[PDB]
Design an enzyme around this catalytic site. Structure first.
Site, PDB file in Angstrom:
ATOM      1  N   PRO A 112       0.788  -1.265   0.000  1.00 31.61           N
ATOM      2  CG  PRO A 112      -1.002  -1.527   1.501  1.00 31.61           C
ATOM      3  CD  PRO A 112       0.321  -2.129   1.089  1.00 31.61           C
ATOM      4  CD  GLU A 113       2.507   3.085  -4.418  1.00 32.50           C
ATOM      5  OE1 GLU A 113       2.689   4.273  -4.769  1.00 32.50           O
ATOM      6  OE2 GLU A 113       2.815   2.140  -5.137  1.00 32.50           O
ATOM      7  CE  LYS A 118       4.595   5.050   0.386  1.00 32.67           C
ATOM      8  NZ  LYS A 118       5.682   4.395  -0.386  1.00 32.67           N
TER       9      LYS A 118
END
Length: 270
Positions: free
Chosen positions: A1-2, A53
């Site tokens: 994930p970003e 993030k």
DNA sequence: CGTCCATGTCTAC
DNA sequence: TAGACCTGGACGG
């Protein structure tokens, strides 16, 4: 994930846990090296916000809940696989490493931090990581200024495909977004970051670092991810223009990470 | 069976 | 900077 994934996870937690009361202890799988979360309440609600993030949960005991307790903040980083999921208390996924359990009335539910690979991490501090830049999604003006003020920093000697992963200046940009962003402006990935940034001291590189991930957030879905149906996942794959797309060239940056681009690799290429 | 690849850090040398 | 940290899926033979 970003960043977009962290953002939608934050929204998922808030929308799902609006009407839910949690109760008891916060439970950790006995294979997670991350710390135990010392917290017990008869009644507490769970909210989230996201910063690039990172995601922050707040556990807020209700009035008169026992033990007497002040709100507690945890901050998560998801590494390569993390996720949040609301499941039936008796259907914990494999790799539910941290788990918040609903009190009755209503059917017993677990908000679970799911992290197949265990690259994710969490801290008791409630604070964002010292050194991380502002959020490209939610602190755009701060993000923009924090770059243009600091082009002197050795960070900007590096090629542009590399600088964009330095979370000190591009908190929330990761390997799919850097590919997608450069493609939009057809900047060679191994063009030097200072050259491309000095220029701005028809949207520009820093405008897109905000607006492109914001396009992921406005698909709905869970950005790059399978929850909200394996339907929304294909809505993302169709949004992608560069990253993994047939036709596109790809190389390894100085740290092994793969940059997808079209045509000219640019001067500082391996 | 096997090999390789994956949205990210994190740290030892 | 090479290597570590992890699991699992898509591919090879």
């Amino acid at each position: 994930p970003e960043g977009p994934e962290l953002h939608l996870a934050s929204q998922f937690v808030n929308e799902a846990c609006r009407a839910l009361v949690f109760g008891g202890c916060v439970e950790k799988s006995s294979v997670s090296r991350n710390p135990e979360v010392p917290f017990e309440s008869s009644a507490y609600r769970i909210s989230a916000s996201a910063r690039g993030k990172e995601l922050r949960l707040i556990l807020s005991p209700l009035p008169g809940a026992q033990p007497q307790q002040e709100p507690l903040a945890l901050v998560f980083r998801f590494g390569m696989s993390g996720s949040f999921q609301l499941v039936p208390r008796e259907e914990l996924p494999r790799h539910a490493h941290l788990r918040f359990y609903t009190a009755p009335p209503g059917p017993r539910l677990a908000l679970c931090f799911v992290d197949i690979r265990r690259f994710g991490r969490w801290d008791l501090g409630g604070k964002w990581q010292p050194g991380r830049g502002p959020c490209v999604l939610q602190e755009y003006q701060q993000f923009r200024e924090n770059v243009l003020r600091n082009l002197a920093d050795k960070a900007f000697d590096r090629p542009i495909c590399e600088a964009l992963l330095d979370q000190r200046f591009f908190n929330g940009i990761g390997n799919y977004l850097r590919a997608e962003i450069l493609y939009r402006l057809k900047i060679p990935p191994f063009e030097k970051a200072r050259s491309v940034l000095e220029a701005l001291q028809n949207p520009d590189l820093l405008e897109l670092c905000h607006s492109v991930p914001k396009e992921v957030v406005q698909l709905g879905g869970r950005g790059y991810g399978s929850e909200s149906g394996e339907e929304d996942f294909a809505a993302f794959r169709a949004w992608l223009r560069c990253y993994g797309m047939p036709g596109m060239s790809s190389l390894q940056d100085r740290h092994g990470r793969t940059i997808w681009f079209q045509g000219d690799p640019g001067p500082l290429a391996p």
